[PDB]
Design a protein around this nucleic acid. Structure first.
Length: 647
DNA sequence: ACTCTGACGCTAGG
DNA sequence: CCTAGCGTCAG
C-alpha cells in the first residue's frame, strides 16, 4: 500500500529522505525477490527463476522514540530495488542504476543490524550489481544476521532448514506464515503484503535465535567467526578460476582410450565379459568364481568376509595383488576412471567461459568445515598420476588445469600438520610439545618415536607414522587402521598402542573428551562450536562407541576448522584494508588458502599472509591461546598444479 | 523408449 | 571421522 515503495519512482527529495532513513534506521530486514515473485523465505530451496529485485524493510525502532511523519512513506516502510535488467539499455536505466547502487551501498555500510535469511546470496547479488562502481572491498565489513547459520550452530546435523521450519521451531509461538504465494497463484498485492509480514516475522525469528545462541554460549563464535565469513564466501563465488578446455578435451580422450584397454585386459584375465564399473560382479568373480579369499590369503581380508565374501575395497584388492592379475587391473581402472570421470569430464561440465566457480556452503558440515560444490575444489587430486600412453611416459595433473589469469599468480598458504598441532595443544603431551620446538616435523617424529635416528629414515614409515597419526586423529581403531596400512590386525594394534603408550596424554585427552560428552550430552571445540551426540547415552554399545569416536574426532577436526576460518577472516580483513594490495581469496582447501594476486605484489602479500596467519597462535578474543606455534608454508605459481616454494 | 529415487559401494580431499 | 561425486541396480 503505502508500505511498499519502488525507489525509482520516488521524488528526489524523498530519495534524499530515504537515504537519511537508511542511515538512521534501527534495523534493516532484507529478502531477495525472484520473478515468480518468490523469495528466499521458501519453501523452494533453489529458485528455478532469476533475481527480480531486493526488498528492504526499514525499521525505525528495534524491538530487541517519538512519532515521525515522513509523508512519502508510512511506518515501517518496505522499499523495493530492481536488480533485473530491462529489454533496452539507455540513460534512464543508468540513472536508476546509480541511485540503486547508492541505496544498496548504504545497506552495506549501515551501522544498524542487517537481517537477511540467506546473506551470502544477497551479498553476491549486490556484488554483481555494483559491477564497475565497486570492488569486493566494499562488502568486506558487511555483517548480516543469518538465522540459518544460527540454527546451524545450534543443531549442525540439519544443513538446510527452510524459513517456515525455523519459524516453527524457534519462534514462540503460534505464528503462521504464507511464504508460497507467487504471481499466477495469486496477485501482486498478496505477494507483496505477505513479503512485508514475513519480513517482520523474519526479524522476530532472528532475534529469538540470537538470544538462544547467547544461551547455548555460541554467540561469540557466531559473531566473531561465522558472520564475517559470509561476504568472503560471496566474494569467492563472484570470481571465476580459468581452466584449459583444449587440454582437458584431449586428456579426456586419452584416458578414455586407456580405460578401454584396461577393460579389455580385465575381461581377458577374468575369463568372461563382466561390467568393469560394477563392484557386485567383480565381487562374484574374485570370490564366487576364482575363490581367492580361500586361497593363500585367508583372513588377510577383514574376516573370511565382511559378510560372506569380502568387499572390493582397495585394501582387500591390495591384499590379493599377488594371487591373480585382476585386482591390479581393477585398481588402475578405478584410478584412471576417477581422474577422467570427475577431474576432467565433470570439470568440463561445470565451466562457463573458460572458467569455473565453486558454490560454498557454510552450513554444510557438522564439524564446522566448509564444503564446496559443483565443482568440489576441495576434492581435486593433489598428486599428478602417471599413465602409460596408448596409441612415452604420460603425466597427468588435475590441479594443473587451474591457472591464474595473467598477469597474476597463485599464492598458496598451507597450515603445516595442523591436526597434529591441535592434538598436541589439546593433549598437552610432553614429547609432541617437544617435537615442534621447525624442520620437517614428521621425520623427526618418526625418529623420536622409533628411537632410530635415521636422518630421513624410511619414506614408507614416514607414511606409516602419518597413517597411524591419522588413525588416532580421526578416532579410532585397530581394524580400520589395519585397513589403511598393509599389515595384519594385530600388527596394527601393536603399532597403535606403541604410539599411544609413547605419548600417554593423547589417551587421557580422548578419555576426557568422552567423559565431557556423556556428562553434557555434547562436545565442544576450541572456539566453542558444539557437537551434540545423544547416542552417547544409548544403551546399544555399538552406537555408544560410535558416539565416543565421533566425540573424540570433533574436537580436533572442529578446532582445525575454527582455526582455518579464523585465518581466512584475518587475512581477508588484512588485505581489504590496504591502499595497495589486490590479492583476492580464490578458494580454501581446508587447511590451505589459495589466493590470486597481481604479479608484482607477490613479495608484499606473501609477507602479509604469513605474518597474519602465524600470529593466530595468540589472539584475543576469544581467550584463544595455543600451546604450540603455527608454521605456515607458502608457495607460488602460474598454475595450481605446479607451485614453487617461497622463502 | 525416458527420468527420477533411494539404498549401497568406492575414493579423492582433509 | 566427514565431505562431494561418481558408479550400479531395482522399482
Amino acid at each position: 500500500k503505502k508500505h511498499f515503495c519502488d525507489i525509482r519512482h520516488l521524488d528526489d527529495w524523498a530519495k534524499s529522505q530515504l537515504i537519511e532513513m537508511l542511515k538512521q534506521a534501527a534495523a534493516l530486514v532484507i529478502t531477495v525477490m525472484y520473478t515468480d515473485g518468490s523469495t528466499q523465505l521458501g519453501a523452494d530451496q533453489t529458485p528455478v527463476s532469476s533475481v527480480r529485485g531486493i526488498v528492504v524493510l526499514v525499521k525505525r525502532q528495534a524491538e530487541g522514540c517519538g512519532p515521525v511523519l515522513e509523508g512519502f512513506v508510512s511506518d515501517d516502510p518496505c522499499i523495493y530495488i530492481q536488480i533485473e535488467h530491462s529489454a533496452i539499455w539507455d540513460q534512464e536505466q543508468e540513472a536508476h542504476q546509480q541511485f540503486a547502487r547508492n541505496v544498496l551501498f548504504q545497506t552495506m555500510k549501515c551501522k544498524c543490524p542487517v537481517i537477511c535469511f540467506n546473506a551470502k546470496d544477497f551479498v553476491r547479488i549486490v556484488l554483481q550489481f555494483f559491477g564497475n562502481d565497486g570492488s569486493w572491498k566494499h562488502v568486506a565489513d558487511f555483517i548480516g544476521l543469518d538465522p540459518r547459520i544460527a540454527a546451524w550452530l545450534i543443531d549442525p546435523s540439519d544443513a538446510t532448514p527452510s524459513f517456515e521450519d525455523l519459524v516453527e521451531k524457534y519462534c514462540e509461538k503460534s505464528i503462521t506464515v504464507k511464504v508460497n504465494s507467487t504471481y499466477g497463484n495469486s496477485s501482486r498485492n498478496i505477494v507483496n503484503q505477505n513479503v512485508r509480514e514475513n519480513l517482520k516475522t523474519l526479524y522476530r525469528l532472528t532475534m529469538d535465535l540470537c538470544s538462544k545462541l547467547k544461551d547455548y554460549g555460541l554467540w561469540q563464535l557466531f559473531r566473531t567467526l561465522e558472520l564475517p565469513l559470509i561476504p568472503i564466501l560471496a566474494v569467492m563465488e563472484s570470481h571465476a578460476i580459468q581452466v584449459n578446455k583444449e587440454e582437458m578435451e584431449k586428456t579426456s580422450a586419452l584416458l578414455g582410450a586407456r580405460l578401454k584397454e584396461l577393460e579389455q585386459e580385465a575381461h581377458f584375465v577374468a575369463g568372461e565379459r563382466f561390467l568393469i564399473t560394477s563392484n557386485n560382479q567383480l565381487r562374484e568373480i574374485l570370490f564366487g568364481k576364482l575363490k581367492l579369499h580361500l586361497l593363500s590369503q585367508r583372513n588377510s581380508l577383514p574376516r573370511t568376509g565382511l559378510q560372506k565374501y569380502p568387499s572390493t575395497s582397495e585394501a582387500v584388492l591390495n591384499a590379493l595383488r599377488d594371487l591373480h592379475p585382476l585386482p591390479k587391473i581393477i585398481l588402475e581402472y578405478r584410478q584412471v576412471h576417477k581422474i577422467k570421470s570427475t577431474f576432467v569430464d565433470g570439470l568440463l561440465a561445470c565451466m562457463k567461459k573458460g572458467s569455473i566457480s565453486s558454490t560454498w556452503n557454510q552450513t554444510g558440515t557438522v564439524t564446522g568445515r566448509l564444503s564446496a560444490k559443483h565443482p568440489n575444489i576441495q576434492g581435486i587430486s593433489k598428486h599428478p598420476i602417471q599413465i602409460t600412453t596408448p596409441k612415452k611416459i604420460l603425466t597427468i595433473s588435475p590441479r594443473a588445469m587451474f591457472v591464474s589469469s595473467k598477469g597474476h599468480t597463485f599464492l598458496a598458504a598451507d597450515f603445516s600438520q595442523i591436526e597434529l598441532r591441535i592434538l598436541t595443544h589439546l593433549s598437552g603431551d610432553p614429547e609432541l610439545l617437544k617435537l615442534f620446538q621447525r624442520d620437517d616435523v614428521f621425520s623427526t617424529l618418526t625418529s623420536q618415536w622409533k628411537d632410530v635416528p635415521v636422518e630421513q629414515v624410511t619414506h614408507a614409515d614416514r607414511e606409516q607414522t602419518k597413517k597411524v597419526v591419522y588413525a588416532v586423529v580421526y578416532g579410532a581403531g585397530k581394524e580400520r587402521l589395519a585397513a589403511c596400512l598393509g599389515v595384519p590386525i594385530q600388527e596394527a594394534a601393536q603399532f597403535l598402542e606403541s604410539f599411544l603408550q609413547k605419548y600417554k596424554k593423547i589417551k587421557d585427552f580422548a578419555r576426557a573428551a568422552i567423559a565431557q560428552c556423556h556428562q553434557t550430552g555434547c562436545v565442544v571445540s576450541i572456539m566453542g562450536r558444539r557437537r551434540p551426540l545423544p547416542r552417547i547415552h544409548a544403551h546399544d554399545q555399538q552406537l555408544r562407541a560410535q558416539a565416543e569416536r565421533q566425540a573424540v574426532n570433533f574436537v580436533v577436526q572442529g578446532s582445525a576448522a575454527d582455526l582455518c576460518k579464523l585465518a581466512m577472516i584475518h587475512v581477508f580483513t588484512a588485505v581489504a584494508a590496504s591502499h595497495t594490495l589486490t590479492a583476492r581469496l580464490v578458494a580454501q582447501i581446508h587447511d590451505e588458502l589459495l589466493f590470486e594476486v597481481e604479479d608484482p605484489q607477490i613479495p608484499e602479500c606473501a609477507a602479509l599472509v604469513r605474518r597474519t596467519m602465524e600470529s593466530l597462535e595468540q589472539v584475543q578474543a576469544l581467550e584463544l591461546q595455543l600451546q604450540v606455534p603455527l608454521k605456515v608454508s607458502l608457495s607460488a605459481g602460474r598454475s595450481w598444479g605446479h607451485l614453487v616454494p617461497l622463502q
